[PDB]
């Protein structure tokens with residue numbers, strides 16, 4: 388078996404290899420990449436997402452989110468407080484202000500130490516889940532707005548025709564902005580391109596060990612666990628690498644820099660944080676190997692994990708026994 392220790396693999400496709408997206412995902416998996424839950428893909432030197440980012444300040448962040456933490460430094464939840472709308476230009480200025488800017492630091496490791504020591508004492512503001520794309524329409528390779536759709540994948544694999552669309556989302560981050568431990572909706576893949584700015588550090592649990600993380604989460608957030616059997620779908624819980632190590636949870640970490648793609652694989656739990664002002668684009672996607680994961684994905688029915696209407700068809704077709712209960716949670 389390839390990659391038995393479930394290490395995060397890094398790929399350097401040639402421009403020829405970068406033509407066929409599906410084929411390269413399958414190639415990465417043939418090398419065991421999926422066992423980590425996360426892979427990095429560095430595009431060939433000839434590739435670019437767009438000409439410049441010189442004209443993006445007028446994008447609107449309609450609902451910036453202030454991420455307010457509760458708990459202890461290594462075990463906390465965060466809730467999102469809605470703030471007034473601001474442009475990306477205004478957001479960038481805010482990110483770079485004395486209140487929110489990245490502190491002096493020696494290297495990525497020093498900054499990581501500072502993040503886990505001090506995150507809970509600040510409330511950074513995130514621009515998340517903004518529908519849109521920053522890929523040039525003429526970018527033909529790994530353009531996250533031009534991928535084959537999950538609906539078409541399901542149709543190709545299972546013969547079912549369903550409603551729904553899936554399009555990319557933009558994320559504007561600043562120092563300490565945080566993404567909580569989660570897998571994707573329906574345990575889909577995700578792909579994330581860091582367009583511009585400071586890095587993003589990722590933590591990931593191998594899919595074959597995801598239930599170990601779930602069991603620890605239930606112990607660490609006991610009230611949340613009683614409220615919902617799948618409460619990590621609420622995307623509010625953080626657990627530090629120190630606490631993961633203390634509890635023997637297998638995981639890996641890696642830092643993504645501007646110009647790099649990350650792919651998360653079905654049922655690969657991940658979390659992380661931004662180093663400073665940046666902009667990422669991400670979208671969910673599927674492959675034939677995903678279908679089994681979609682069938683088995685655990686659902687939140689408590690009402691906290693409201694999702695896109697695109698997910699209705701996924702649950703309806705792949706999980707008909709769970710559909711009624713889940714739909715009650717969505718309404």
Ligand SMILES: O=C(O)CNC(=O)C(=O)O
Nearest residue numbers: 558566577578579667669
């Ligand atoms: O970048 C972020 O804030 C969160 N991204 C993801 O969880 C992802 O790409 O799957």
Ligand code: NI
Nearest residue numbers: 570571577651
């Ligand atoms: Ni994700």
Ligand SMILES: [Zn+2]
Nearest residue numbers: 615687689691
């Ligand atoms: Zn729930």
